[PDB]
């Protein structure tokens, strides 16, 4: 029941000592299903440090302190094992390999593109798959609708402009425009499809008056000649 988020809400509300999530046998064990070993760098570890530093005063009303100390012992043991493996890795380095540049350029571009979940090439009907396209379009829409509007830029070429305390250089909004062109092109996607349907169904509905090899055909010329036959009168 969001045991890692309840401590964050109690830290943001500045009232983590009056309730302290009320860790008991029926409350601290229901939200955990021993803490579940969070995987953040410091966003969920400093909260555990503060949660240990606050509860040093009651000293008996919370029973998960032993599990938190065992988790800290596991973290220290993993840190010591990682330092011994880092020493073994730095002592196990061969002297000469002469690593090339082209394979490095192949690895860096692919590892940069695989960070932010986009397509990378190798260079080494159907409604079931359209919902999967719409779920990726709406994902980027909901991602671009969470950016702050007060976004400014700073390039490495501004030092020739001599920006004073009140200067207003003309290279501040070079990324705020590009953060809106994508957001308003993902919304006009259904707008351009109507123009494409009005264009293709007007340039391809005839297809036998401007294209020469389709109007120079023996079947098509005879058909266009024979559909214009006026009905014969009687007597």
């Amino acid at each position: 029941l969001q045991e890692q988020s309840e401590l964050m809400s109690t830290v943001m509300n500045n009232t983590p000592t009056t309730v302290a999530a009320l860790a008991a046998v029926a409350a601290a064990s229901e939200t955990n299903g021993t803490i579940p070993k969070p995987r953040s760098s410091a966003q969920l570890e400093q909260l555990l440090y503060r949660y240990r530093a606050i509860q040093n005063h009651p000293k008996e009303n919370k029973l998960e302190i032993k599990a938190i100390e065992d988790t800290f012992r596991n973290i220290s043991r993993d840190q010591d094992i990682y330092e011994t493996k880092l020493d073994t890795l730095r002592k196990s380095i061969d002297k000469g390999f002469q690593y090339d540049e082209d394979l490095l350029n192949k690895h860096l571009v692919a590892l940069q593109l695989l960070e932010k979940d986009t397509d990378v090439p190798d260079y080494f009907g159907d409604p079931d798959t359209e919902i999967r396209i719409s779920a990726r379009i709406s994902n980027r829409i909901n991602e671009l609708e969470r950016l702050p509007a007060n976004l400014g830029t700073y390039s490495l070429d501004d030092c020739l402009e001599f920006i004073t305390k009140d200067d207003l250089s003309s290279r501040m909004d070079t990324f705020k425009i590009k953060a809106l062109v994508e957001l308003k092109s993902l919304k006009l996607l259904t707008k351009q499809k109507s123009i494409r349907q009005k264009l293709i169904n007007n340039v391809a509905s005839q297809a036998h008056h401007n294209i020469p090899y389709l109007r120079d055909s023996p079947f098509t010329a005879a058909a266009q000649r024979s559909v214009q036959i006026r009905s014969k009168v009687i007597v």
Partner: protein, 51 residues
């Protein structure tokens, strides 16, 4: 900016932003869409760029 741009069919970020602004304003009447870019772009050319 307000000055004249470079040679045509370059389509910088201002010219790409103002057309998508004007389409969300009017949704038709491309004579009122071409001048929202700045007037230096054609009605027959802005449709070819938007498609």
């Amino acid at each position: 900016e307000n000055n004249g741009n470079s040679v045509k069919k370059n389509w910088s970020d201002q010219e790409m932003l103002l057309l998508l602004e004007g389409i969300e304003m009017y949704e038709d009447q491309w004579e009122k869409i071409a001048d929202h870019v700045g007037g230096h772009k054609r009605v027959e050319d802005c449709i070819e760029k938007f498609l």
